[PDB]
Amino acid sequence: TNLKADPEELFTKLEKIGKGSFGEVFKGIDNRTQKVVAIKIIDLEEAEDEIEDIQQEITVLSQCDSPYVTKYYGSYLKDTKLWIIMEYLGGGSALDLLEPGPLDETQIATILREILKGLDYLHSEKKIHRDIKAANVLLSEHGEVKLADFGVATPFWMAPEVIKQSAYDSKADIWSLGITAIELARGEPPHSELHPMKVLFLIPKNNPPTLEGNYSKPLKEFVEACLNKEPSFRPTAKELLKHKFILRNAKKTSYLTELIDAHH
Numbered sequence: 490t491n492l493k494a495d496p497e498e499l500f501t502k503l504e505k506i507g508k509g510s511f512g513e514v515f516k517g518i519d520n521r522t523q524k525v526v527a528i529k530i531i532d533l534e535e536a537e538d539e540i541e542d543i544q545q546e547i548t549v550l551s552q553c554d555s556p557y558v559t560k561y562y563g564s565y566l567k568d569t570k571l572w573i574i575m576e577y578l579g580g581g582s583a584l585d586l587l588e589p590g591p592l593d594e595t596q597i598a599t600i601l602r603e604i605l606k607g608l609d610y611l612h613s614e615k616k617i618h619r620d621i622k623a624a625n626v627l628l629s630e631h632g633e634v635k636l637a638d639f640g641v642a643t644p645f646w647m648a649p650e651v652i653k654q655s656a657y658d659s660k661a662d663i664w665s666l667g668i669t670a671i672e673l674a675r676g677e678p679p680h681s682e683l684h685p686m687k688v689l690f691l692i693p694k695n696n697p698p699t700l701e702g703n704y705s706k707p708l709k710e711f712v713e714a715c716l717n718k719e720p721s722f723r724p725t726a727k728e729l730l731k732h733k734f735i736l737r738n739a740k741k742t743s744y745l746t747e748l749i750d751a752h753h
């Protein structure tokens with residue numbers, strides 16, 4: 490965390506991307522490199538309770554060096570405002586691109602596959618994302634898919650063992666991915682119309698959700714493989730990259746450029 494170099498001199502904000510975790514995020518320019526950056530600015534006095542959360546997410550992402558995790562560039566503290574500088578991803582989130590209209594399975598598989606490479610890099614480094622969902626998967630202008638907005642230590646994407654506050658491992662991410670697959674194919678997670686507290690007991694109590702509708706069987710089997718109530722019966726991210734649904738449908742990441750151009 491740099492406190493001597495003035496972030497307002499190092500960076501040129503250009504537009505507000507939107508609100509984010511605990512602060513506003515800007516599309517910006519590193520003035521030394523003139524590369525585009527994402528800049529979250531947090532007033533630490535206005536969010537004193539969540540500061541360990543902020544610290545934890547900075548710590549976990551500063552330890553990631555993978556094409557599939559949003560790159561971390563540093564932090565700056567000017568008076569009470571913390572600037573968190575990250576890679577900028579100009580294609581938006583996976584959830585943004587579900588809004589132009591329902592995704593076909595080629596796009597679902599290609600995004601799923603890229604997410605899985607992120608999960609497998611993380612899980613091999615003994616890390617957990619803890620909040621895998623469409624809104625936390627960001628895409629570049631050229632179709633690359635990267636994980637962002639890590640959780641630290643809404644329930645719709647949570648594994649049943651996570652809800653029941655048991656010690657959870659990488660298999661929680663696998664469950665969340667199975668929910669994300671349903672989201673990318675349907676637009677929203679299971680139980681999305683229900684009050685969160687109801688969903689909090691539905692997930693431990695009920696059978697795993699399955700992908701309903703007119704989809705190919707491998708997509709349904711990909712989902713149900715992820716959505717196993719027992720975490721130790723969920724495949725690794727490495728296993729799932731060989732799932733028949735991924736092998737038959739996933740394309741090159743550049744194929745998504747068309748879908749990204751639809752959103753703009």
Ligand SMILES: CNc1ncc2cc(-c3ccc(-c4nc(C)ccc4OC)cc3Cl)c(=O)n(C[C@H]3OC[C@H](N)CO3)c2n1
Nearest residue numbers: 509510514527528529543546547550575576577578581624
């Ligand atoms: C659209 N393009 C795009 N490119 C890049 C980003 C990067 C972030 C981002 C994320 C997290 C943290 C962070 N935060 C804390 C609290 C601690 C440490 C942290 O980083 C180490 C910092 C940033 Cl700079 C960002 O908010 N967004 C927008 C964001 O997308 C996901 C969506 N769910 C909400 O809106 C982005 N957008």
